[PDB]
Design a protein around this ligand. Structure first.
Ligand SMILES: CCCCCC(=O)OC[C@H](COP(=O)(O)OCC[N+](C)(C)C)OC(=O)CCCCC
Ligand SMILES: CCCCCC(=O)OC[C@H](COP(=O)(O)OCC[N+](C)(C)C)OC(=O)CCCCC
Length: 177
Protein backbone atom coordinates (compact mmCIF):
# COMPACT_ATOMS: atom_id res chain seq x y z
CA UNK A 1 0.00 0.00 0.00
CA UNK A 2 2.65 2.52 -1.14
CA UNK A 3 2.36 4.97 -4.03
CA UNK A 4 3.61 3.51 -7.30
CA UNK A 5 2.12 0.16 -6.38
CA UNK A 6 -0.89 -1.87 -7.49
CA UNK A 7 -3.19 -3.51 -4.92
CA UNK A 8 -6.30 -5.66 -4.93
CA UNK A 9 -9.07 -3.39 -6.18
CA UNK A 10 -11.25 -4.33 -3.23
CA UNK A 11 -8.52 -3.08 -0.87
CA UNK A 12 -8.69 0.49 -2.06
CA UNK A 13 -10.44 2.76 0.46
CA UNK A 14 -9.96 6.03 2.39
CA UNK A 15 -7.54 4.65 5.03
CA UNK A 16 -5.14 3.36 2.34
CA UNK A 17 -5.16 6.79 0.75
CA UNK A 18 -4.65 8.53 4.10
CA UNK A 19 -1.69 6.22 4.69
CA UNK A 20 -0.28 7.32 1.33
CA UNK A 21 -0.86 10.99 2.26
CA UNK A 22 0.81 10.62 5.60
CA UNK A 23 4.05 9.17 4.09
CA UNK A 24 4.56 12.43 2.15
CA UNK A 25 4.98 14.14 5.49
CA UNK A 26 4.49 17.78 6.23
CA UNK A 27 3.67 19.79 3.12
CA UNK A 28 0.68 22.10 2.75
CA UNK A 29 -0.73 20.72 -0.47
CA UNK A 30 -0.56 17.05 -1.35
CA UNK A 31 -2.82 14.40 -2.83
CA UNK A 32 -3.10 10.61 -2.66
CA UNK A 33 -4.81 9.11 -5.69
CA UNK A 34 -6.52 5.69 -5.94
CA UNK A 35 -8.17 4.39 -9.14
CA UNK A 36 -9.99 1.07 -8.99
CA UNK A 37 -10.08 -0.63 -12.44
CA UNK A 38 -13.19 -2.80 -12.67
CA UNK A 39 -13.64 -1.71 -16.35
CA UNK A 40 -13.12 -5.26 -17.61
CA UNK A 41 -10.06 -4.02 -19.42
CA UNK A 42 -6.35 -3.80 -18.82
CA UNK A 43 -4.78 -0.38 -18.49
CA UNK A 44 -1.23 0.58 -19.38
CA UNK A 45 0.53 3.68 -18.04
CA UNK A 46 0.70 6.51 -20.52
CA UNK A 47 1.82 9.51 -18.49
CA UNK A 48 1.21 12.28 -15.98
CA UNK A 49 1.11 16.02 -16.66
CA UNK A 50 1.49 18.54 -13.84
CA UNK A 51 0.13 22.03 -14.27
CA UNK A 52 1.33 22.65 -10.70
CA UNK A 53 3.41 20.56 -8.30
CA UNK A 54 5.07 17.22 -8.92
CA UNK A 55 5.25 13.58 -8.05
CA UNK A 56 8.34 11.42 -7.55
CA UNK A 57 6.22 8.27 -8.18
CA UNK A 58 6.41 6.26 -11.39
CA UNK A 59 2.93 5.28 -12.66
CA UNK A 60 2.31 1.57 -12.21
CA UNK A 61 2.96 0.02 -15.60
CA UNK A 62 -0.11 -2.30 -15.89
CA UNK A 63 -3.37 -2.12 -13.91
CA UNK A 64 -5.40 -5.23 -14.70
CA UNK A 65 -9.16 -5.54 -14.17
CA UNK A 66 -9.63 -5.96 -10.37
CA UNK A 67 -6.53 -3.97 -9.41
CA UNK A 68 -6.23 -0.44 -8.06
CA UNK A 69 -3.27 1.81 -8.70
CA UNK A 70 -1.89 4.05 -5.95
CA UNK A 71 -0.32 7.34 -6.75
CA UNK A 72 0.50 10.64 -5.10
CA UNK A 73 1.65 14.21 -5.67
CA UNK A 74 2.67 17.33 -3.72
CA UNK A 75 3.39 21.05 -4.28
CA UNK A 76 7.00 22.08 -5.06
CA UNK A 77 9.10 23.31 -2.10
CA UNK A 78 10.34 26.43 -3.91
CA UNK A 79 9.70 30.10 -3.10
CA UNK A 80 6.62 30.55 -5.35
CA UNK A 81 3.89 28.51 -3.72
CA UNK A 82 1.72 26.56 -6.14
CA UNK A 83 -0.64 23.70 -5.47
CA UNK A 84 -0.74 20.23 -6.93
CA UNK A 85 -2.72 20.13 -10.19
CA UNK A 86 -2.57 17.54 -12.95
CA UNK A 87 -3.76 14.77 -15.23
CA UNK A 88 -3.00 11.09 -15.27
CA UNK A 89 -3.50 9.21 -18.55
CA UNK A 90 -3.79 5.41 -18.94
CA UNK A 91 -4.44 3.59 -22.24
CA UNK A 92 -7.06 0.88 -22.05
CA UNK A 93 -6.93 -2.37 -24.01
CA UNK A 94 -9.85 -1.11 -26.19
CA UNK A 95 -7.46 1.43 -27.76
CA UNK A 96 -8.98 4.34 -25.82
CA UNK A 97 -7.47 6.58 -23.12
CA UNK A 98 -8.61 6.99 -19.45
CA UNK A 99 -7.84 10.48 -18.12
CA UNK A 100 -8.10 11.74 -14.53
CA UNK A 101 -7.85 15.33 -13.39
CA UNK A 102 -7.04 16.63 -9.91
CA UNK A 103 -6.66 20.14 -8.67
CA UNK A 104 -5.56 21.01 -5.14
CA UNK A 105 -4.89 24.75 -5.31
CA UNK A 106 -2.63 26.80 -3.09
CA UNK A 107 -4.66 29.98 -2.51
CA UNK A 108 -8.07 28.89 -1.33
CA UNK A 109 -9.20 32.53 -1.23
CA UNK A 110 -9.61 32.13 -4.99
CA UNK A 111 -9.84 28.45 -5.84
CA UNK A 112 -11.19 25.14 -4.53
CA UNK A 113 -10.54 21.44 -5.09
CA UNK A 114 -11.72 19.91 -8.39
CA UNK A 115 -11.38 16.51 -10.08
CA UNK A 116 -12.59 14.93 -13.30
CA UNK A 117 -12.54 11.61 -15.18
CA UNK A 118 -13.10 10.94 -18.89
CA UNK A 119 -12.46 8.43 -21.64
CA UNK A 120 -10.96 9.93 -24.76
CA UNK A 121 -11.46 8.17 -28.04
CA UNK A 122 -8.12 6.75 -29.10
CA UNK A 123 -4.63 7.20 -27.75
CA UNK A 124 -4.08 10.58 -26.05
CA UNK A 125 -1.23 11.92 -23.95
CA UNK A 126 -1.78 13.86 -20.68
CA UNK A 127 -0.87 17.49 -21.49
CA UNK A 128 -1.79 21.17 -20.89
CA UNK A 129 -4.66 21.06 -23.40
CA UNK A 130 -6.10 17.95 -21.77
CA UNK A 131 -5.89 19.70 -18.36
CA UNK A 132 -7.69 22.71 -19.80
CA UNK A 133 -10.45 20.65 -21.38
CA UNK A 134 -10.88 18.70 -18.21
CA UNK A 135 -10.68 21.68 -15.77
CA UNK A 136 -12.62 24.30 -17.69
CA UNK A 137 -14.85 22.50 -20.25
CA UNK A 138 -15.83 18.97 -19.18
CA UNK A 139 -17.97 19.58 -16.07
CA UNK A 140 -15.37 18.61 -13.44
CA UNK A 141 -16.60 17.67 -9.95
CA UNK A 142 -15.94 19.58 -6.75
CA UNK A 143 -13.69 18.03 -4.13
CA UNK A 144 -16.71 18.42 -1.85
CA UNK A 145 -16.34 15.29 0.35
CA UNK A 146 -19.15 13.56 -1.58
CA UNK A 147 -19.46 10.80 -4.19
CA UNK A 148 -20.25 11.65 -7.80
CA UNK A 149 -21.26 9.08 -10.44
CA UNK A 150 -21.05 9.47 -14.22
CA UNK A 151 -21.46 7.29 -17.34
CA UNK A 152 -18.26 7.49 -19.46
CA UNK A 153 -19.54 5.90 -22.66
CA UNK A 154 -17.73 2.89 -24.07
CA UNK A 155 -19.61 0.61 -21.68
CA UNK A 156 -18.00 2.21 -18.65
CA UNK A 157 -18.98 4.47 -15.73
CA UNK A 158 -17.24 6.06 -12.75
CA UNK A 159 -17.89 6.80 -9.10
CA UNK A 160 -15.43 8.97 -7.18
CA UNK A 161 -14.83 11.02 -4.09
CA UNK A 162 -12.39 13.86 -3.36
CA UNK A 163 -12.20 15.73 -0.03
CA UNK A 164 -12.20 19.53 0.27
CA UNK A 165 -8.88 20.12 2.04
CA UNK A 166 -5.24 20.82 1.04
CA UNK A 167 -4.22 17.33 2.14
CA UNK A 168 -6.36 15.60 -0.52
CA UNK A 169 -7.54 12.12 -1.40
CA UNK A 170 -9.06 11.03 -4.68
CA UNK A 171 -10.62 7.64 -4.99
CA UNK A 172 -12.21 6.64 -8.31
CA UNK A 173 -13.95 3.32 -9.15
CA UNK A 174 -14.21 2.66 -12.92
CA UNK A 175 -16.87 -0.06 -13.52
CA UNK A 176 -18.94 -1.48 -16.42
CA UNK A 177 -22.12 0.35 -17.36
C1 LIG B 1 -3.85 35.10 -5.28
C2 LIG B 1 -4.54 35.23 -6.64
C3 LIG B 1 -4.38 33.91 -7.46
C4 LIG B 1 -3.97 34.33 -8.90
C5 LIG B 1 -4.08 33.17 -9.91
C6 LIG B 1 -2.71 32.47 -10.09
O1 LIG B 1 -2.32 32.08 -11.20
O2 LIG B 1 -2.04 32.29 -8.90
C7 LIG B 1 -2.11 30.92 -8.54
C8 LIG B 1 -0.91 30.21 -9.18
C9 LIG B 1 -1.21 28.79 -9.55
O3 LIG B 1 -1.80 28.33 -8.35
P1 LIG B 1 -2.23 26.89 -8.18
O4 LIG B 1 -2.81 26.88 -6.71
O5 LIG B 1 -1.12 25.93 -8.35
O6 LIG B 1 -3.37 26.66 -9.20
C10 LIG B 1 -4.40 27.61 -9.47
C11 LIG B 1 -5.46 26.62 -9.85
N1 LIG B 1 -5.62 26.44 -11.32
C12 LIG B 1 -4.31 26.22 -11.98
C13 LIG B 1 -6.38 25.17 -11.42
C14 LIG B 1 -6.36 27.49 -12.02
O7 LIG B 1 0.11 30.22 -8.17
C15 LIG B 1 1.06 31.10 -8.53
O8 LIG B 1 1.43 31.26 -9.69
C16 LIG B 1 1.64 31.89 -7.38
C17 LIG B 1 1.49 33.37 -7.74
C18 LIG B 1 2.67 33.69 -8.66
C19 LIG B 1 3.67 34.40 -7.75
C20 LIG B 1 4.84 34.90 -8.66
C1 LIG C 1 -13.44 37.93 -2.36
C2 LIG C 1 -12.99 37.01 -3.49
C3 LIG C 1 -14.20 36.54 -4.33
C4 LIG C 1 -14.10 35.04 -4.74
C5 LIG C 1 -13.47 34.80 -6.14
C6 LIG C 1 -14.03 33.52 -6.82
O1 LIG C 1 -15.22 33.23 -6.69
O2 LIG C 1 -13.12 32.75 -7.54
C7 LIG C 1 -13.43 32.56 -8.96
C8 LIG C 1 -12.23 31.97 -9.75
C9 LIG C 1 -12.10 30.47 -9.41
O3 LIG C 1 -12.52 29.88 -10.62
P1 LIG C 1 -11.99 28.53 -11.37
O4 LIG C 1 -11.13 27.47 -10.40
O5 LIG C 1 -11.24 28.99 -12.57
O6 LIG C 1 -13.50 27.95 -11.69
C10 LIG C 1 -14.01 26.80 -11.07
C11 LIG C 1 -14.98 26.23 -12.10
N1 LIG C 1 -14.29 25.40 -13.15
C12 LIG C 1 -13.43 24.37 -12.51
C13 LIG C 1 -15.29 24.67 -13.93
C14 LIG C 1 -13.46 26.22 -14.06
O7 LIG C 1 -11.00 32.61 -9.37
C15 LIG C 1 -10.31 33.41 -10.22
O8 LIG C 1 -10.12 33.19 -11.41
C16 LIG C 1 -9.69 34.58 -9.54
C17 LIG C 1 -8.57 35.02 -10.44
C18 LIG C 1 -7.68 35.73 -9.46
C19 LIG C 1 -6.73 36.57 -10.29
C20 LIG C 1 -6.09 37.51 -9.25
Amino acid sequence: DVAGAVIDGAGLGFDVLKTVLEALGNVKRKIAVGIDNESGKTWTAMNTYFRSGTSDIVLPHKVAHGKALLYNGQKNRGPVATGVVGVIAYSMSDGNTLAVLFSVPYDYNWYSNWWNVRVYKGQKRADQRMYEELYYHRSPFRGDNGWHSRGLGYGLKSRGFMNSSGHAILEIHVTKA
